[model samples]
Target: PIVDTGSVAPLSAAEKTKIRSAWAPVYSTYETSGVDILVKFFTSTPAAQEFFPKFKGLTTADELKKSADVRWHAERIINAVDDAVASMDDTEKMSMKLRNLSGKHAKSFQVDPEYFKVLAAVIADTVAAGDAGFEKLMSMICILLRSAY
Candidate 1:
């Protein structure tokens, strides 16, 4: 089942450790990571970028980097991840937090469900590099977020 891929399975010790090793560095400088993630997201998928009205007419990395609003929202996006990653071990709490976030994005931002996958991909790349375990962890985030939509 396509949807089954998103389900949260128990993380092996090695897998969880790998995620933390990859994430700890990201935790320190999520501000830079936020813009890095968003700029790359916008560059790769302008349609995703279109969702932000304030980001309208902001296509180039140069323009996006200069906008205070972009930086503000970009950090907020990464901050959400910070919250999620912090509670990675407590699946019950983490899932509840993310499910609420899923509703908020769907209702408040009117975000299309698929964008969660796209943004998740970018967040993983920005924070986890190419670690497969990290990607797997992020895949769950996508499923949880999209579930509400």
Candidate 2:
């Protein structure tokens, strides 16, 4: 079974409080990087605009919450992440698969590599905010997201 690690760890009540109070700013900064690329891609790439018509109407989270297609994509992504994390023991293989998946999305979305680079920057920024336990949690999220994407 594909475990929802995001739900299982670092999101329990105690962790949630810490994340909201102490760690949220860092995550917000991290998320900003990704949002930037997404906005740029949606606005500049005509093909992407056609495929994701809801892009202009709401935030990424909002789209995921409201759009059926987007929600399905999100669930598919999480399942992929669960599989990759459980089966692929090698980090390089994991990372390669992630990049390839992103590239595929680029083609499908008609966005360029530069946009993914921005997304990568966001991941890096998010990972950099680690402090002991948070680092491990951040790494997990990074690895999971890579596989999910």
Candidate 3:
């Protein structure tokens, strides 16, 4: 986990394995679960919905879930997350990839770093029969996502 003002450390082999385990189920059902995460994220902070024009007017999970734009964007977000976990064992590659992803958000969407923290928690809680290790993984992800800022 990121300590106040501290950077994230790399995950250990055991920690990496734990994250992969937790992610497997989510990856299997991504098209459905992806919308669940994004809608759930926007509900936590509805203003965040404006980041995507397609989802701007919709706030409720049910409404957003039915929106194809929301579903496509959700898959975009979740796909990156799944890829991050898949490549996590390679520190050099993972950091490079995630930071570049952060750069896009910082430049293109001007996304708030704080939202990454919120999104990470939403993802952790959403898939949380196995949270302890997952949250740590999320913190590491948040740390990297916070990098471009």
Candidate 4:
């Protein structure tokens, strides 16, 4: 049988409320742009095109809504970005943790540095597609991405 080795303490009511409030803007941004970025990246990138067969041509909102892969990946990317943002605001130790996370993907995916650079370009382009504020937001995201390396 599976044992409970994870942390036992769950969030208190106040903490849960705070966490919900804190994640609001992250969720909002994700809804506005992050979702599109993930969908576009998955649809456009050769790696994702090969690996995630269901995401091809999922560059638009309508297409994304119809695709489970696009929907899932969009949420995954948004949550990752949100974690990075939260870490930037609240924690220093998360840098190493984030780097380790990147390393795991790097190893498994055998992700080339060039691939990361391409992802960076795509993320920047996606951010730019949103609004003027997204430029600053993307700059912050870029700094976090570099920290993971």
Candidate 5:
């Protein structure tokens, strides 16, 4: 289920080409995309906003739009996602790294496993808006993420 042991396969060369092509433009503006992702996450799940104390009291759309803390967090998230995408070709390695990340989030940050789904859905939707191949790419990422949970 989580890691497809034989169910899901690695991305093919053509899929990689399509993904990379579509991702380049978005990654180029990762800061913006990152902010949008966080905004979407917080908006859809307001209770999740408690995770970021730095953005405390700045929950409103207008306030977060101008908050430096929010921007910083968004940049960090984008960088992490970028790294994950870069390693998509090697699922074993990606799974290991994501497992570790998942542990950190669940153990240290007390993040709920369900939140990963939320993040994935948000990223998938965001990517889908711009690129047609987003679902395929995000599907793999989500599966890998689930392995961690």
Candidate 6:
């Protein structure tokens, strides 16, 4: 069983297998899933779009959707997600990496911590569709991300 204590919990052999299997396809087409996540986020919170200067002046989702900058940002986010998932077994290391990321976002981008929750929800609804364990894992990650902000 998965526990949500706002901390990383140990994954049983069965849980590991389940999460790995569910994430395989997502990791395979990470680019597509990554873009989908960003699109969903921007669509849900249009005001958040101001954070990305690349999408500035683009009032429409369709225009932002077509921008190469969007794809670039998506790929970067997916790469980070890939790194985090790969390091899931090493929670300490994962937390450190994410904390660093969160600090950068908070200090440099001036991003609100609340946005992490939004991103996690979008990911859970999309990339983590069928895996309850992965959803829990993502929630834990989001919690860790928020802590750094």
Which candidate wins on TM-score? 1
Q: Give a tens-digit lDDT track for model 2, residues 1-149.
A: 11213442333445434433444443344334334434444434434444555545655544534555554443453344344434334656655666566556645655433233333333333434333333333344444444434
TM-score for candidate 4: 0.53
Which consecutive 10 residues in model 2 have the weakest lDDT in total? 1-10
Candidate 4 to native Cα RMSD, angstroms = 11.4
Model 1: lDDT equals 0.77
The order by descending lDDT is 1, 3, 6, 5, 4, 2
lDDT of 5 by residue, 27-47 (tens): 889868777888888888898
Pairs of residues at least 3 apart in sequence or in different chains that clash in candidate 4: none
Q: Mind giving the per-residue lDDT tens digits that candidate 1 earns over 1-149?
A: 11214366667889888888778777678667777888888888888877788889886899987788887997777777777778878989888988999898899988877777777887777765677777777878888887676
TM-score, one value per model: 0.89, 0.36, 0.88, 0.53, 0.81, 0.85
**Residue ranges of candidate 4 with Cα displaced over 4 Å:** 1-26, 29-32, 42-44, 51-65, 89-91, 128-149
- Give a tens-digit lDDT track for model 6, residues 37-63: 788889889878877887887676677
lDDT for every model? 0.77, 0.43, 0.77, 0.51, 0.69, 0.74
Model 3 TM-score (2 dp) = 0.88
- Angstrom error of the Cα, residue 106, model 1: value is 1.4
lDDT of 4 at 52: 48
The better-scoring model by lDDT among 3 and 4 is: 3
Tens digit per residue, CA lDDT, model 4, 21-134: 544665677655565665566556756554445565655557775666666666777676566545544446545555665665556554443344445455546533333333
- Cα lDDT over the full model 6: 0.74
Q: Is candidate 3 or candidate 6 better by lDDT?
A: 3
Query: Which is better, 1 or 3, measured by TM-score?
Result: 1
